[model samples]
Target: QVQLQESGPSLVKPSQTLSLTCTVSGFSITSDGVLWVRQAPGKALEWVGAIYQNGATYYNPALKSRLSITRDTSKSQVSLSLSSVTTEDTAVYYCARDTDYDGMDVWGRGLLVTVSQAVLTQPSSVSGSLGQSVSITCSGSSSNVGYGNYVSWFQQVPGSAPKLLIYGATSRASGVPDRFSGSRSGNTATLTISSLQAEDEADYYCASGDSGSSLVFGSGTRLTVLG
Candidate 1:
């Protein structure tokens, strides 16, 4: 099985640089690519960096000035370096296999980082009964939401790839539950889970395009199936 993990070696300080490594197993970094994504408390996810298989790196247009993504072929690792980070940059960072098909395949759990005592969580968790319903909401500034990017949802189980649940805001993906619904209003987007079931309990994420070739994901919300 493919595996990925992120490491933060020290207590990151303001204006200091960070080099976090994404160590991978069961695959070759020289062949398959990896990506760096992050989310601060109450902020939208950002696609800060990506390392390609052939040793090329790409960064989000908005962040390219302060980001560098690279790979160490001999070490089976992809690395990300961000400069001049601040409290707003305090985020849960994640690394995942870059899938050519679309979206991430396997993702790291998440690494929480503190910055000047600031953090971000977009509706961290939610709960609902088997028959009741719940709605997970996600919103950002106009630059981050409703900026011509399509919104999507995914259900990430304990150990597996995220299953696409919604695309194009309100459209459902294959095999998605009839109980699940998606919609948006002004600057807000939401995933509504009605007629909840045990099987629906999973980490749900909202994602939208970052720029030309990158994606931004929400901090994620946990759906607990209540009795």
Candidate 2:
């Protein structure tokens, strides 16, 4: 029942830096990890990075060069900084807590940030040949609660239970698709598919463990056009 809140400048100029801070209550930053996420207009959430109370940080390599994650244990706060941002960087940011054992069990209510005052983009249709590879990305714009910033991936087909695909970026769940893979560079967690198949088309989601026992999830990606 811990609460997490994010505060920062609402508007960020193109080619400039975007910064936000998350303040945690009823928890100690020294004992947990703080994470950042972003959501583009009409798109899924994305993992940005994370910071431990001791000032240690890990970022998605894809976003590492432009991202910096830090925390202030004295103030019970965590911060995110992205440099050389563009219109593509504008989105709703969120903060969350990371669980010590498993998936993100708690999450923060989201905050929105618009880029170019533009409408949300339409989701794209995926097309892939059998035995080939495909991937879908989900990201968010904020971090509020959670213990660690570790990224997670899942797969859901039809009415079946959602299956754990990947965790910590590279490790695969037992019985997961061999073609499905994951990795993180900087602030972005990426899922890659090698040798795509017809049955691989469905829905994918990326999530992370936030403070406490809460979990945060991306909107979801509908993967289609399987060969």
Candidate 3:
């Protein structure tokens, strides 16, 4: 019975600051962690950062310089502030609550900001036969993945929150199968799924810490399992 809704400007001017607020209900803002995520038009989801109930904060290394997340426990509201925005900053911003291992458990519909201007890029789709192996590659620049920044991969089906698969560019999330492995080489990050099964089919996305003020997300790759 918990819910979150994002509110902010529909358009932001270049080089300006972007602000947004998340109004939450049915749950205490101090009960868990709240996070910010964004998606460029036709792109995969990217994490802006997060705030814990204890007032601690964690931001994407890439966006660390300009992004801040705060909250008002008394009002059950969380706020996101990003400075020095550009056209690349234009996207749909979302607010979500974190869970033990399910990635984000609840999300707001999203607020669109157009200052904008952003990626790690991925193939539009990939395919593999059952029992076979397929690798989804996310390419970035020297400023991000290539520079040894951390990377994480996620799986999103038609409905449901995106599920964490790999973190730190190589570590599998809790309960994640060994068949799913993450690797990095130069400017590219890879998520390889072995012994593919029907359940493995889904949209996969990669996010990398930009050496710059935001985490960069790949455009997303749809995996297809063949018979």
Using Cα atoms with residue i matched to residue i, what is each candidate's TM-score against the true structure? 0.65, 0.55, 0.65
Cα lDDT tens digits, model 2, 1-227, are: 57778788888777777888898887788876777767676656666777765677877656778988877778888888889887888777868676465444334555665444011121345567777667665544334112334667866563433456777767776567577888765545668888877777877777665433334566576777543
Is 1 or 3 the stronger prediction by lDDT? Answer: 3
**Where in model 2 is the C-alpha error above 4 Å?**
116-227
Top-scoring candidate (lDDT): 3
TM-score of 2: 0.55
Predicted candidate 1 versus true structure: per-residue lDDT over 17-58, tens digit per residue: 877888899888876778787766554456677787787777
| Model 3 weakest 10-residue run by lDDT | 98-107
Compared with the true structure, all predictions reach lDDT values of: 0.74, 0.66, 0.81
Angstrom error of the Cα, residue 76, model 1: value is 1.0
